[PDB]
Amino acid sequence: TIPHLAIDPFSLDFFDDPYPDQQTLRDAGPVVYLDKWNVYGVARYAEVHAVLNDPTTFCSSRGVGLSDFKKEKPWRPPSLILEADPPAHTRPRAVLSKVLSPATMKTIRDGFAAAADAKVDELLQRGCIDAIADLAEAYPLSVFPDAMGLKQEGREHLLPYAGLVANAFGPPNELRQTAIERSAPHQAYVNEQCQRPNLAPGGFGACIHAFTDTGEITPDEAPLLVRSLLSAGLDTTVNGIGAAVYCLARFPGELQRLRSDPTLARNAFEEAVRFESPVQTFFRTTTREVELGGAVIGEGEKVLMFLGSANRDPRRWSDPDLYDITRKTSGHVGFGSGVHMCVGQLVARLEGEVMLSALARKVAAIDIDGPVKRRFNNTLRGLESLPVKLTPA
Numbered sequence: 001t002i003p004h005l006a007i008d009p010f011s012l013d014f015f016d017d018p019y020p021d022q023q024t025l026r027d028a029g030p031v032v033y034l035d036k037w038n039v040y041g042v043a044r045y046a047e048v049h050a051v052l053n054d055p056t057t058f059c060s061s062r063g064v065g066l067s068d069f070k071k072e073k074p075w076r077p078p079s080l081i082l083e084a085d086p087p088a089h090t091r092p093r094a095v096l097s098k099v100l101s102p103a104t105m106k107t108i109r110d111g112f113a114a115a116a117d118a119k120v121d122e123l124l125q126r127g128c129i130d131a132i133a134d135l136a137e138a139y140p141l142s143v144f145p146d147a148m149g150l151k152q153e154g155r156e157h158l159l160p161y162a163g164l165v166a167n168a169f170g171p172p173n174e175l176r177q178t179a180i181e182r183s184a185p186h187q188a189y190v191n192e193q194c195q196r197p198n199l200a201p202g203g204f205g206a207c208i209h210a211f212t213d214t215g216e217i218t219p220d221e222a223p224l225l226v227r228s229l230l231s232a233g234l235d236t237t238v239n240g241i242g243a244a245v246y247c248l249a250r251f252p253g254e255l256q257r258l259r260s261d262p263t264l265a266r267n268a269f270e271e272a273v274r275f276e277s278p279v280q281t282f283f284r285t286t287t288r289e290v291e292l293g294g295a296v297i298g299e300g301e302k303v304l305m306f307l308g309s310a311n312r313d314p315r316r317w318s319d320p321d322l323y324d325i326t327r328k329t330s331g332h333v334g335f336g337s338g339v340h341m342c343v344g345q346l347v348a349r350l351e352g353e354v355m356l357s358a359l360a361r362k363v364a365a366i367d368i369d370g371p372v373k374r375r376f377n378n379t380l381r382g383l384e385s386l387p388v389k390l391t392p393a
């Protein structure tokens with residue numbers, strides 16, 4: 001009944017060009033079985049959205065990766081927020097929701113905006129730059145670690161740690177085994193910068209530890225909640241901003257519309273989030289025998305969600321392969337959906353908006369003038385280098 005496919009969604013050939021295989025996964029049926037890793041797969045928008053909004057049946061406490069926490073021990077202590085189910089997930093979620101609240105973005109927006117308005121000017125003085133290293137990475141690194149309240153020493157560990165966390169959700173391929181092999185130095189620093197004495201007052205991490213008084217989390221739970229933002233608060237914004245620049249580089253008509261109306265910058269970033277989906281996949285584990293798409297999945301089965309394929313499903317989106325800064329992006333699962341929907345989506349949209357805003361007001365053209373190289377990861381889509389030449393407006 002369920003179609004079986006040998007497609008490896010975690011191979012380098014799949015990362016180079018996932019779109020042909022993602023249509024094969026979508027059109028093969030609402031639910032597929034991937035013989036390479038013995039998992040169920042959903043690639044259409046409807047099933048991916050239904051799985052995300054059914055946390056009781058498709059839980060996350062047994063791991064959002066391939067590995068079953070009930071069968072294998074996790075490579076690191078489980079996330080109190082990402083790898084937990086209600087009700088144990090609720091209160092750590094509420095703390096991170098208030099630390100990254102709408103009232104919090106007001107205190108950092110101008111600093112977020114001025115730094116974006118300072119980087120575009122710096123890169124315009126150089127002309128030919130790398131949109132990944134000198135923009136997609138340089139801008140969030142100049143903004144997010146300080147907003148977290150981080151020290152300056154050892155800051156070159158976060159991006160290797162962030163890339164390793166996303167790589168560990170994948171199967172035991174080389175990408176995962178090579179990552180975890182180079183882990184202990186990155187883990188030691190990250191865990192070190194989760195303790196209360198190492199967080200600057202007023203930063204995100206200090207606010208998390210302040211939320212131990214409220215009784216929603218204990219002091220022993222705050223370092224893990226700080227570790228969640230150190231694992232997820234940087235590299236997805238890097239790939240998200242690096243996606244918008246690439247999309248504006250190959251869709252020059254969309255760049256010119258953004259120039260004429262800079263207020264489209266926020267939705268232009270939301271469109272780049274749907275179009276590229278910096279988080280490609282995430283797992284769930286069936287807590288019961290469940291029927292989905294005419295397929296009866298047993299208990300304790302890993303179900304793979306293709307968030308990028310769901311953001312390009314023609315059953316839900318018109319012209320899903322086109323970058324449209326005026327598209328009604330509401331409903332896309334680039335940030336997830338349900339009780340686990342990205343708690344730091346306001347921080348990511350703030351960084352993406354003010355950067356596309358600075359580009360909309362100061363850049364006239366973005367021309368790719370160098371070899372474009374992709375960055376391979378089991379969970380994250382993103383470019384290693386994007387050599388572009390910026391024309392000042």
Ligand code: HEM
Pocket residue numbers: 060064081082083093096100228229232233234236237239240273277278279282307333334335336337339340341342343344345347348
């Ligand atoms: C373009 C930027 C980003 C993208 C595409 C993204 C993507 C996602 C997705 C798809 C999920 C759902 C995970 C799941 O349902 O299993 C998620 C959750 C999460 N994200 Fe993000 N994220 C981004 C930025 C951020 C930022 C800036 C932060 C923190 C400052 C962050 C922290 C988290 C955390 C802690 C969770 C777990 C929420 C929960 O389990 O309830 N992410 N993210």
Ligand SMILES: CSc1ccc(C(=O)O)cc1
Pocket residue numbers: 079080081082083165166227228229231232279379
């Ligand atoms: C790649 S999305 C993500 C990664 C890690 C965490 C966490 O550390 O809790 C949350 C979201």
